[PDB]
Amino acid sequence: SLIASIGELLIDLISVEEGDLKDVRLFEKHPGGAPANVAVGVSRLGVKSSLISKVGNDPFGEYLIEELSKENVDTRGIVKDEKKHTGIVFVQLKGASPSFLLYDDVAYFNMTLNDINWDIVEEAKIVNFGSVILARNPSRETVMKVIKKIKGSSLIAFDVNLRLDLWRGQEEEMIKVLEESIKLADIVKASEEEVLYLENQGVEVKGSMLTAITLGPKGFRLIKNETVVDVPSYNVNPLDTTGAGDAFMAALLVGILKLKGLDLLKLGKFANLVAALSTQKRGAWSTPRKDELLKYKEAREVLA
Amino acid sequence: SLIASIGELLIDLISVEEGDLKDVRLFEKHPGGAPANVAVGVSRLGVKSSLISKVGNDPFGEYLIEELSKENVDTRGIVKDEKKHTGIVFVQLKGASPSFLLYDDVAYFNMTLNDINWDIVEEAKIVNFGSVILARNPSRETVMKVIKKIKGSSLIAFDVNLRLDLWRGQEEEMIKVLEESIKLADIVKASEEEVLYLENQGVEVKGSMLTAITLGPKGFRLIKNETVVDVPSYNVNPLDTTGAGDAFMAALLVGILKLKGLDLLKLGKFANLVAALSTQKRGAWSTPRKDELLKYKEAREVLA
Ligand SMILES: Nc1ncnc2c1ncn2[C@@H]1O[C@H](COP(=O)(O)OP(=O)(O)NP(=O)(O)O)[C@@H](O)[C@H]1O
Numbered sequence: 001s002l003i004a005s006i007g008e009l010l011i012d013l014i015s016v017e018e019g020d021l022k023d024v025r026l027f028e029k030h031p032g033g034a035p036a037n038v039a040v041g042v043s044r045l046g047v048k049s050s051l052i053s054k055v056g057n058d059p060f061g062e063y064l065i066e067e068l069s070k071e072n073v074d075t076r077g078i079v080k081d082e083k084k085h086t087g088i089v090f091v092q093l094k095g096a097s098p099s100f101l102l103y104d105d106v107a108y109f110n111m112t113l114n115d116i117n118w119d120i121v122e123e124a125k126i127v128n129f130g131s132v133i134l135a136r137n138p139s140r141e142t143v144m145k146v147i148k149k150i151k152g153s154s155l156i157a158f159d160v161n162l163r164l165d166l167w168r169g170q171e172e173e174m175i176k177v178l179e180e181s182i183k184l185a186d187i188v189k190a191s192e193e194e195v196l197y198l199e200n201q202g203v204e205v206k207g208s209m210l211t212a213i214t215l216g217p218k219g220f221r222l223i224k225n226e227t228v229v230d231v232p233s234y235n236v237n238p239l240d241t242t243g244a245g246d247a248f249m250a251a252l253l254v255g256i257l258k259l260k261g262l263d264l265l266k267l268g269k270f271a272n273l274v275a276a277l278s279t280q281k282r283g284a285w286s287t288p289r290k291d292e293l294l295k296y297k298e299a300r301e302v303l304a
Numbered sequence: 305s306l307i308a309s310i311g312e313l314l315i316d317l318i319s320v321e322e323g324d325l326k327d328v329r330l331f332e333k334h335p336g337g338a339p340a341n342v343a344v345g346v347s348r349l350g351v352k353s354s355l356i357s358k359v360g361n362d363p364f365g366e367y368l369i370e371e372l373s374k375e376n377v378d379t380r381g382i383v384k385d386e387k388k389h390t391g392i393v394f395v396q397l398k399g400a401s402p403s404f405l406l407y408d409d410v411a412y413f414n415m416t417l418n419d420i421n422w423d424i425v426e427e428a429k430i431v432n433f434g435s436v437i438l439a440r441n442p443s444r445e446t447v448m449k450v451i452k453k454i455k456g457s458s459l460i461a462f463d464v465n466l467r468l469d470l471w472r473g474q475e476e477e478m479i480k481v482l483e484e485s486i487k488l489a490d491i492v493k494a495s496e497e498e499v500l501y502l503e504n505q506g507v508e509v510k511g512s513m514l515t516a517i518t519l520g521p522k523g524f525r526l527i528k529n530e531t532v533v534d535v536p537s538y539n540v541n542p543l544d545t546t547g548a549g550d551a552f553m554a555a556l557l558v559g560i561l562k563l564k565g566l567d568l569l570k571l572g573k574f575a576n577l578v579a580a581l582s583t584q585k586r587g588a589w590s591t592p593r594k595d596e597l598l599k600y601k602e603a604r605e606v607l608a
Pocket residue numbers: 465494495518519520521522523524537538539540542545548549550552576579580583
């Protein structure tokens with residue numbers, strides 16, 4: 001029962017104080033990258049996890065592999081780039097206007113077909129990927145080729161996770177690769193904003209097997225073949241919602257992998273529980289551990 | 305008179321705690337880059353200073369330009385790159401073995417001939433550069449062409465500032481460029497360690513007009529045509545010596561510009577004073593300001 005994530009793996013330099021990145025003085029270093037965040041979540045839920053990515057031959061690349069190893073995420077598919085350094089992004093999560101500065105000339109955007117460990121990806125039942133990694137070549141063509149290649153042997157999950165800043169000057173190609181990725185996906189996760197934006201350009205944001213649309217404060221919605229199920233969010237006191245989204249995706253993939261048929265109700269309750277609890281942990285890796293979850297019936301239904 | 309510096313301008317992310325960069329958790333952001341440090345030093349000493357470099361069209365590029373402007377440094381020659389981000393370097397100054405992680409695929413290494421403001425360069429009486437910017441093309445060929453084109457129309461200063469990590473795989477090409485740069489230099493500055501490294505590979509570390517060899521805390525030595533002067537450092541209890549070298553250079557260049565002749569005595573004392581006092585300020589921009597210097601006889605002789 002393997003779940004493989006392929007994409008960006010990087011260092012998040014999170015602003016410690018408020019203000020535009022221009023005026024932030026202090027930063028905290030943490031591991032980041034949607035695919036890596038989900039990989040860690042999947043692992044915490046008790047499912048063997050693998051990450052396919054590329055870091056530089058430097059201290060930060062070493063740091064990320066170490067942190068991933070501590071979470072028991074299979075790191076064999078993470079290649080070290082001798083020319084490009086570990087990906088980094090400076091982020092400001094605070095304030096009404098969260099912002100970021102992502103360095104694109106880095107290792108994870110430099111993946112080529114010869115970097116892919118095919119044994120690992122062919123061994124997975126579900127392969128997860130996002131749009132961020134597709135923002136630049138060679139990683140874009142590489143990822144698309146890998147997906148097209150394993151289609152049929154593995155369920156393909158795609159988190160839209162759209163970041164317009166990463167496509168300035170190539171919006172036409174963006175629409176094309178996103179649409180192509182969606183059509184290749186059995187599982188598609190997106191926000192209503194992303195659904196509107198995309199559909200407002202002739203692109204239908206839907207998975208062939210399952211679609212999950214996040215509604216921010218209203219919770220989320222699980223759509224399958226005209227059968228729609230809405231799930232309001234739990235009312236709790238969040239300490240940090242930074243990793244909620246990826247905690248949700250992890251849960252959703254683990255649930256799909258675990259339950260016989262795709263029972264939207266049980267899946268929704270499980271996903272919801274994981275996300276809700278993730279808000280009680282700090283950081284990008286806030287997914288709760290299997291243990292903390294067994295105390296819940298909505299979790300035993302999928303993990304136990 | 306105007307002194308122009310050409311080279312790296314970047315963001316220094318300084319480790320807050322000790323330890324390997326892999327483990328450092330907190331980093332403080334500050335403006336950095338030898339040429340920029342010298343540019344600021346020159347302006348503080350009351351001389352018109354211009355910096356020729358390239359930053360990204362991003363928050364950090366804006367931060368650097370703003371900071372330089374607060375120091376009255378002419379930034380007209382600082383170009384914004386639409387394709388590369390602002391240079392950055394993660395730094396560990398603490399410990400027995402300080403280290404760094406310099407991101408090389410950044411804006412300041414991507415300078416082309418059309419990025420150079422020739423008006424500013426030609427108008428300068430002294431043009432200063434260092435070896436770091438020569439680490440990668442196109443900046444390397446660009447800087448060499450500029451120096452060769454003004455050679456003879458302006459004094460040329462070169463701070464060896466040797467960083468081996470930046471030349472791995474190209475150690476031989478390194479020696480060639482340093483040799484040629486030193487030979488194009490009227491004024492050469494280097495530490496005794498560097499002198500013993502180059503001359504040990506058939507490289508003579510000497511300027512055609514003046515040579516400055518530093519000896520760390522002990523002091524420095526000014527050499528001009530077989531005339532060797534030893535300047536023992538003034539006694540001080542250092543708060544931070546990070547910017548001492550660049551403060552020394554800024555002083556050395558302002559002295560050379562102001563002094564009718566090349567009185568190595570009036571030059572030594574001045575540079576010695578400026579460097580010594582710089583140890584009383586924290587950070588890469590530690591050059592004392594002119595107003596703090598007018599209280600010293602050794603300084604008035606040069607500025608007043
Ligand atoms: N503790 C100190 N007390 C007095 N003067 C100092 C002290 N440390 C440095 N200096 C002065 O500042 C000058 C700068 O030297 P240093 O910091 O070694 O710069 P550098 O030669 O560029 N070395 P680097 O660029 O770090 O490889 C010295 O030659 C001294 O004259």
